Each structure stands twice: as structure tokens, then as C-alpha cells.
Design a protein around this ligand. Structure first.
Ligand SMILES: CC(C)(COP(=O)(O)O)[C@@H](O)C(=O)NCCC(=O)NCc1ccc2c(c1)OCO2
Ligand SMILES: CC(C)(COP(=O)(O)O)[C@@H](O)C(=O)NCCC(=O)NCc1ccc2c(c1)OCO2
Ligand SMILES: Nc1ncnc2c1ncn2[C@@H]1O[C@H](COP(=O)(O)OP(=O)(O)O)[C@@H](O)[C@H]1O
Ligand SMILES: Nc1ncnc2c1ncn2[C@@H]1O[C@H](COP(=O)(O)OP(=O)(O)O)[C@@H](O)[C@H]1O
Ligand SMILES: [Mg+2]
Ligand SMILES: [Mg+2]
Lengths: 272, 272
């Protein structure tokens, strides 16, 4: 009756009652408060996934079954895409969580085709180092209207009056313009926009590269890293389109794993 | 008689006299001092490449021919590999300059197969933001013995007592451990090691991904970003090996473009 994806930073909960979902999030830091909540419900089985699933299972007396997050994510995302009118033959999905995991879905199953440590954790952690802000809403709100111009170097900055070998407006070097602007006021907003910029550019670069390798035009982006971060969504969407791919975002995409755990548990029951 | 690769951060000069090379570097910031030097030599032709080639050409009266850096880099690197006893049938080369450009060499010619703004410029620029150090030797020396443990999150930190779906020692999130260590002394050395860490991990991830796509085990790493940066070299080499590829570094690899410009100019002369 409950699906829980207990990830590196957020615990995603999907409560099912009367054929409708109720979505909840809690910080993984507060995992004990998830157990508290569970102990006040009338749940007969936990469908778990994610790195911290074992911690919940070992701290509560409710029967639990654990599912590997890659398969749970892929299944929940498949459900959400169909619910939302997308009938895709294949796609890359990039799960931009605490870190970023990349998968190719061929129409039937997923395989992991790469990963990178540039994701939501870097946004928070490097963000804190450059701004001293710990609150996620404060951090991301501050970043939205930051100006990356004095921090990031573009191809045209290097090639100047010469026509460049690749488009001039492309980022050549994240943070590569800093040393050209050493008298600049590197504001917290500007610095944080550059952090979101580099995370978005790296994720998208990897996603479009495996899209080419596995011969799909479709890239689906999920993960809580996009929550309250319109800038990140735009950086990713824009570059995806520029490189000839189609980006998709999913309503409640961050809950793919939790939805997938519930579904996998259902269909685990069979016999031969 | 002179090959010059005038890049985003360094100007690489190869002087040829009596069948032996003389290598020089100057900061692109100091491009006027390269023109000064040129005006004191007895050079009859400049073989130029790189983003700032046009600037040198327009500020001096010596005849000049310009070559596209991707082809000049590939050619000079081919020469250097053979000089150094490597006879490779194919390879990826990653040019880790101010930014990073990735190429597949099939045995005959190169094509660019990707790029990313994580490279030497980010090391300097983000390094400056986290440390206030502008001097490259100071910056990189400070980073060498930094401890990334309190800054970077590993897969085992998320999965804890549960066997993880990918190896536990892998970086899950660059800077992802910062919020778990908010009372930590984030020393300049530690912060800079993490900057070098993320740049190395992203470059290597992209290089091994295009190596798989283009079916080669060989990855050659060039660029001045490796100079005075043993940590970067190690981060890259280690992960390359872990992902089943063979890393190569090249003596004077940073001068590939300059060597290639000289060679291309030579052989541009022909007729039909
Ligand atoms: C670990 C995962 C699956 C946990 O999922 P969550 O993010 O949903 O909690 C996720 O964060 C992830 O896939 N992270 C990226 C892991 C990865 O592929 N790293 C790449 C990498 C690249 C280079 C490296 C390195 C690791 O170790 C040393 O050098
Ligand atoms: C521009 C180049 C060729 C100049 O050579 P140098 O570094 O030798 O001076 C080199 O720095 C390079 O290839 N840089 C990386 C360029 C790149 O591929 N960027 C990727 C990228 C990724 C995402 C982006 C984006 C650009 O613009 C907006 O979103
Ligand atoms: N309320 C929040 N608190 C903290 N981080 C948040 C919040 N909402 C979104 N995020 C972002 O989402 C990231 C986690 O994404 P998620 O897909 O839940 O990863 P995981 O499965 O690793 O928990 C965080 O690192 C952060 O960037
Ligand atoms: N003496 C130096 N001064 C500045 N940067 C240096 C120096 N030596 C090495 N570097 C590093 O090398 C990077 C530039 O590499 P390079 O291959 O020369 O790029 P480009 O062709 O863009 O000039 C710098 O961003 C820096 O990280
Ligand atoms: Mg997750
Ligand atoms: Mg260069």
C-alpha cells in the first residue's frame, strides 16, 4: 500500500488509496520521521527501493520487499509517460538525483549506460561552498536570475574575430571567464547560476552522447534536482534541443522509483 | 620555421632549428610579448593555429598561414605518438585545454565526437572562487595533497550496509558530502582537490563513453591542464583503467597543435 524510494537526499513516498496517489517527500536526514509516520498508518506491506531502503526495513516491523532502483525507476517512469500521453518507442532517461544515472530504454527494458557525479548533490554542496546557503529553496531561488557572463567563457571569447570551428555561443569553459573578471563582484546569485549551469551542461552532454550511441532521439529527464529549479530545466532543455534531441519532463517524475516499487511488488506475484 | 598554437589560455610555440624542437609557452594574456619575441627572430613564415592565431597574424608583418586546430592537434599528436613508440590503430584523444574537446581517430583522420566545458579553465576559475589563488603553480601545488573525503559523496555512503548496484567506492556526487560535514574545515587544499576531481571525472567519463561508442580501447590525453597537476593525471588514469580502457599521456602533448601546424604547412605544398 506504500511505495518508498529512500534516496541519498530525499525519501519519496507514494501512498495509494482508492486508485489515487498521494505524494510525500521527507529528507533522508530525517529517515526516523518516516518510520514515525509509518508507525501511525495501517500499512500491511512496504514496497522499498533506493540506497536507504535497508535502513527503513530494519527499523520497522511491517513486512517489506526491496527492489533495485534502476528497474523500479524505469518501470514507474514507463507508467507515468503513458499516463501523460507519451508513447515512446525508446529513449534515454537521465535520473538527476543526488548524483546522475543514465539509462537506455529499448521499448522493453532498461540498461544503465553511464553515470556522473554532477547532479543535485553538487548543486547543494558546491552551492554551499560559494554562498554559505544551506536551505534548498533559498539556494535555488537565489540562483534563478544569476548572470553567468563574467564567470563562463564562450567559444567566441577564445576565437574573437575568427569564425570558430564550432558555434561561437557555446560554453567553452565553465568558470573560464573568472580570471578575466578578477575585479568583478562575484555575487552569490551569479556564482550559483554558474554551478547550476555546469551541472546542467554536463548531464545534458552525457545524455545526448548516449542518445547518439544507442540511436534514440528521445531523452526523458527525472529527479528531484529539477524541483524549484527552472534555470536547470532550461539549461538542460535548451542544449538537448540544440543537439537535435527531444527533451521530456514528467509530472511527478521524481516519484518514478516509488511508483515502480509498488507496481513491481504487485506483479512479483505469479506462478508457473 | 615556427609553429604557434595560440589557445584560450596559453600560447604554445615550437621553434625548429637543425632538426630539433625548442618548446616555449607564454600566457595568451601576454600575446603582445609573443609578437615582441617574433619581431626579434629571423622567421620567414608563421604556421598558426588556435583561437588567437588571427590576433598574431594581424599584428605582425611576417607571412602567416592558419590551420584549424582539430586537424593540427590530431596531426601533431600522431607524430608524437610514433616518435614515442606508440603505433595505435585507433584512439579517442581528449584535448584538455581551457575547455575539453574529444576526438575519434580511426587510423587516418580525426572527427570531433564531443566536448565539455570542464577543463583547465574551470580548474583555475572555480579554484580562484574557492581559494582566492590566481597563480597557477600555487593553485595546483596546493591541490595535490587535498583530501576530498568530506566534500565528495560515494555510492557506499548512500547504500550503507546494502550491497550497491554499482561499485561502492565510485563517486556518487561531487561535492555531495559537504552538507554532511557542515562543521568541517573546508580547507583550500581540500576544496581544490575536489575541483580537480570533478573536472577529471567528467573528462574521463566522456572519453570512456565515446571510446565505447566508437569501439576503441585507447584514450590519449593531451593539453596543458596536466602540467604541474599529478592529481589530475591520476584521477584520469585511474578511472580510465577502471572502465577497461588504456590511457596514454604524451611527452610534450600540449604542443601537438603547434607541431601539427608546422607539419601541415610543409605538406600543403604540392601540385597535380
Ligand atoms: C549512485 C546512484 C545510483 C544513487 O542514486 P540516487 O542518486 O537516486 O540516490 C546515483 O547517484 C549515481 O548513479 N551516481 C553517479 C555514479 C557514477 O556513475 N559516477 C561516475 C564516476 C566517474 C568518475 C569516477 C567515479 C565515478 O569514481 C571515481 O572516478
Ligand atoms: C572551444 C575549444 C575548441 C577551444 O580550444 P582550446 O580549449 O584549445 O582553446 C575547446 O575549449 C572546447 O572544445 N571546449 C568545449 C566546447 C563544448 O563542446 N562545450 C559543450 C557544451 C555543453 C553544454 C552547453 C554548451 C556547450 O553551451 C550551452 O550548453
Ligand atoms: N526539499 C528539498 N531538499 C533538498 N533537496 C532538494 C529538495 N527538493 C529538491 N531537491 C534537489 O533534488 C536532489 C535530490 O534528487 P532525488 O531525485 O530526490 O535524489 P535521491 O534519490 O538521491 O534522493 C537534491 O540533491 C537537491 O538538489
Ligand atoms: N603556466 C600556466 N599558466 C596558466 N595555466 C596553465 C599553465 N600551465 C598549465 N596550465 C593549465 O592548462 C590550461 C590550458 O591548457 P591548454 O592546452 O594550453 O589550453 P588552450 O589551448 O586553451 O590555451 C589552463 O587552463 C591551466 O589549467
Ligand atoms: Mg534517487
Ligand atoms: Mg588548445
Amino acid at each position: 500500500k506504500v511505495g518508498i524510494d529512500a534516496g541519498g537526499t530525499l525519501i519519496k513516498i507514494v501512498q495509494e488509496q482508492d486508485n489515487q496517489r498521494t505524494f510525500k517527500t521527507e529528507l533522508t536526514k530525517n529517515i526516523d520521521q518516516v518510520v514515525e509516520w509509518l508507525n501511525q498508518q495501517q500499512i500491511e506491506k512496504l514496497c522499498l527501493t533506493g540506497g536507504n531502503a535497508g535502513v527503513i526495513a530494519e527499523n520497522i516491523n511491517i513486512p517489506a520487499q526491496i527492489f533495485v532502483e534502476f528497474d523500479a525507476a524505469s518501470q514507474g517512469l514507463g507508467i507515468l509517460l503513458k499516463e501523460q500521453g507519451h508513447d515512446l518507442a525508446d529513449y534515454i532517461f537521465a535520473n538527476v538525483g543526488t548524483g546522475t544515472s543514465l539509462h537506455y530504454f529499448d521499448g522493453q527494458s532498461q540498461r544503465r549506460v553511464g553515470g556522473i557525479g554532477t547532479g543535485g548533490g553538487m548543486i547543494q554542496g558546491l552551492g554551499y561552498l560559494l554562498s554559505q546557503i544551506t536551505d534548498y529553496k533559498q539556494l535555488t531561488d537565489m540562483a534563478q536570475h544569476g548572470d553567468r557572463n563574467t564567470i563562463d567563457l564562450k567559444v567566441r571569447h577564445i576565437y574573437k574575430d575568427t569564425e570558430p570551428p564550432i558555434p561561437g555561443d557555446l560554453t567553452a569553459a565553465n568558470f573560464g571567464h573568472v580570471l578575466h573578471h578578477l575585479d568583478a563582484d562575484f555575487t552569490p546569485s551569479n556564482k550559483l547560476a554558474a554551478v547550476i549551469g555546469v551541472v546542467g551542461e554536463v548531464v545534458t552532454t552525457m545524455a545526448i552522447t548516449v542518445a547518439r550511441e544507442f540511436k534514440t532521439e528521445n531523452i526523458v529527464y527525472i529527479g528531484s534536482s529539477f524541483h524549484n529549479n527552472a534555470l536547470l530545466r532550461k539549461v538542460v532543455e535548451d542544449y538537448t534541443v540544440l543537439r537535435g534531441c527531444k527533451p521530456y519532463y514528467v509530472e511527478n517524475g521524481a516519484f518514478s522509483g516509488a511508483i515502480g516499487a509498488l507496481y513491481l511488488e504487485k506483479h512479483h506475484h505469479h506462478h508457473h
